[PDB]
Amino acid sequence: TPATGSAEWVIPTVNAKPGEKVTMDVVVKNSAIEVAGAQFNIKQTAPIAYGSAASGDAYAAIVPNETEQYYAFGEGIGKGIKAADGAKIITLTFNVPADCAKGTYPVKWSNAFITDTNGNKITDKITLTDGAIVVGDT
Amino acid sequence: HMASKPVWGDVNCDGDVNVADVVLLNKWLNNNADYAMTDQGKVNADCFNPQDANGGAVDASKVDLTKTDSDAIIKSVVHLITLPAKG
Ligand SMILES: [Ca+2]
Ligand SMILES: [Ca+2]
């Protein structure tokens, strides 16, 4: 009986100046599904540089491949967790070069696979909403 | 069949190694009865200090399954390592 409901996982859209370190909290919205584990890439559009990832407390501890910006979590005893609305799945820091041209630089999900407590794919039940760093001026 | 070769990390025997395998092993490690893990699954799951790291056929009743096997699987899923591991 695959976990029934849904959630939305949101990479935020933030404003930034050239030269700025940007911390992006990737958060759960309309949380209505028990998630046991997930794996996904999140990648920023150039020339924004990648800093690092840190675990959020929405679901379970993040296991990060920092070279590949490939991330995964799996609840320690295979339970599904219904995260609190707005809770952080993962937190990603980026650095905007001083010579970054004005514009929208997407930060996007890819290669997502999400599982419930019994190993069933629930990726389709999770809306994966891309964000961006919108670069302004200096 | 009394022994079988591992497909490393494929706990649920579906041909993919992903977080479903991690979740199901964690569930089984927590309580053996919560997941009907197959003999093949057991052989597949034992990827940290496995019986035979060269990948020949092994006995499912002689696997040693721990949380470190799960840790190795999740690391392999995000390409931090390749299976099998030791320590
Ligand atoms: Ca599998
Ligand atoms: Ca082992």
Numbering used by the authors:
A (entry chain A): 740 to 877
B (entry chain B): 644 to 730
Show me the paper's own sentences about this structure.
The cellulosome is a highly intricate molecular nanomachine produced by anaerobic microorganisms to efficiently deconstruct complex plant cell wall polysaccharides, such as cellulose and hemicellulose. Protein-protein interactions established between dockerin (Doc) modules, located in the cellulosomal enzymes, and cohesin (Coh) modules of the scaffoldin molecule are the primary force for cellulosomal assembly. To date Ruminococcus flavefaciens, a Gram-positive anaerobic bacterium of the Firmicutes phylum, is the only ruminal species that has been shown to assemble a definite cellulosome. Finally, ScaA Doc, the unique member of group 5, binds exclusively to ScaB Cohs 5–9. This latter interaction has a central role in cellulosomal assembly as it allows the binding of up to five ScaA primary scaffoldins to ScaB and up to 10 more enzymes to a single cellulosome.
Here, we report the crystal structure of the R. flavefaciens strain FD-1 Coh-Doc complex established between ScaA Doc and the fifth cohesin of ScaB (RfCohScaB-DocScaA). The structure included two molecules of the RfCohScaB5-DocScaA heterodimer in the asymmetric unit, with each Doc coordinating two calcium (Ca2+) ions, as well as 1 acetonitrile and 225 water molecules. RfCohScaB5 displays an overall typical elliptical Coh structure containing nine β-strands forming two β-sheets in an elongated β-barrel displaying a classical “jelly-roll fold”. β-strands 9, 1, 2, 7, 4 comprise one sheet while β-strands 8, 3, 6, 5 are positioned on the opposite face. RfDocScaA comprises three α-helices, two of which (helix 1: Val-662 to Asp-677; helix 3: Lys-710 to Leu-723) are arranged in an antiparallel orientation forming a planar surface on the Doc that interacts with CohScaB5. These two helices comprise portions of the two classic Doc repeating segments, each containing a bound Ca2+ ion in loops located at opposite ends of the module. In contrast, the pattern of Ca2+ coordination in the C-terminal repeat is displaced due to the 12-residue loop insertion between Pro-693 and Ser-704. Thus, the C-terminal Ca2+ coordination adopts a tetrahedral configuration involving the side chains of residues Asp-689 and Asp-712 (both the Oδ1 and Oδ2) and completed by the main-chain carbonyl groups of Phe-691 and Asp-707. Helices 1 and 3 of RfDocScaA make numerous contacts with RfCohScaB5 β-sheets 8–3–6–5. The side chains of Val-662 and Val-666 at positions 11 and 15 dominate the hydrophobic recognition by contacting with the RfCohScaB5 hydrophobic platform formed by Ala-775/777 and Phe812/852.
